Design a binder for this molecule. Sequence first.
Ligand SMILES: CCC[C@H](C(=O)Nc1ccc(S(N)(=O)=O)cc1)C(C)(C)C
Ligand SMILES: [Zn+2]
Length: 257
Amino acid sequence: HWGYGKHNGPEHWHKDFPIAKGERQSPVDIDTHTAKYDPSLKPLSVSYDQATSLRILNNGHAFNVEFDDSQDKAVLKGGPLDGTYRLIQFHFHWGSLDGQGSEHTVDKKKYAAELHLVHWNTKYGDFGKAVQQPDGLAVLGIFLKVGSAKPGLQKVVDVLDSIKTKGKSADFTNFDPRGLLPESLDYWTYPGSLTTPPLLECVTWIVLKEPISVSSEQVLKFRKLNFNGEGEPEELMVDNWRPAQPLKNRQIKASFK
Ligand SMILES: CCC[C@H](C(=O)Nc1ccc(S(N)(=O)=O)cc1)C(C)(C)C
Ligand SMILES: [Zn+2]
C-alpha cells in the first residue's frame, strides 16, 4: 500500500495511480516573481463561526480533524470560487526537521509544515461525488514556520497522545478552526489535485501568503505520532509530504500585489 517510505513513497505512486503524472498535479513550487496579480479575484470569504468539529482520526498518513458537513456550517466562498464549499476536515503535512515538511514551496523554500483545510462544492451533494469533478474541492493551504506557539493549535497538540497509532480516533468537539488562521487572507491560487493517492485532479488550491508560527514543542509533538498500528513496530509519522510537481500548463494567480 502507498505511503511515504523508500519503497512505497511518492516516486512509486504512479504505478497504482497513473494520474500521478497528470496535467494538474499538486503540490507545486510557487514562484512568487512569476505569479500574476489578478485584480478580478475576489476576497476570500471564510465563514467558520458555526463550525462543528466532531472527531480527530489518525488514518496512518496524517491525522484528520473532521467536521459536520451535513449543513452549511463552516464554508469557504469567494476568491477564485463560484459557489459554496463546505469544510469537511483539516490535516497537516510535516517534516522530521524544521527545514522541511511543507508540500507547496515558495521560491523553492520549504516550511516546517503545511495545514490543509479541505472543502467540497455543495453543488455535488457529497464529498465522494465532489472528488470526481474538476471543481469539486477547494483546499485552503497555510504554511507553518517554527517560532512562537500558536495558541489555537494547542488543543490539537494535546489530544495527539490519544491517537498515537493508525486507526485510533478521539472525540474532538467544539474546536474552532478560526484559531489556525493568519491575519492576512492574501493568497495564491491554481488548479491542482489531491496530494495523496488517489491524486484526483479536483482541487482549486488557495495557498495563503502569510504563514502561522508554531512552537518547536508543538511540531515536536506532531513527530511523536505513528504511521503504524498499535502492536506493530514503531515508525514515526514524519515526512508525510509529497514534493513539488511540474507546473505544466498552469499559471499561478495572486490576489495581491
Ligand atoms: C477519494 C479521497 C479519499 C479520502 C480523502 O479525503 N483523501 C484526501 C487526500 C488528500 C487531500 S490533500 N493533502 O488536502 O490534497 C485531501 C483528501 C480519504 C481517503 C477517505 C481520506
Ligand atoms: Zn493535505
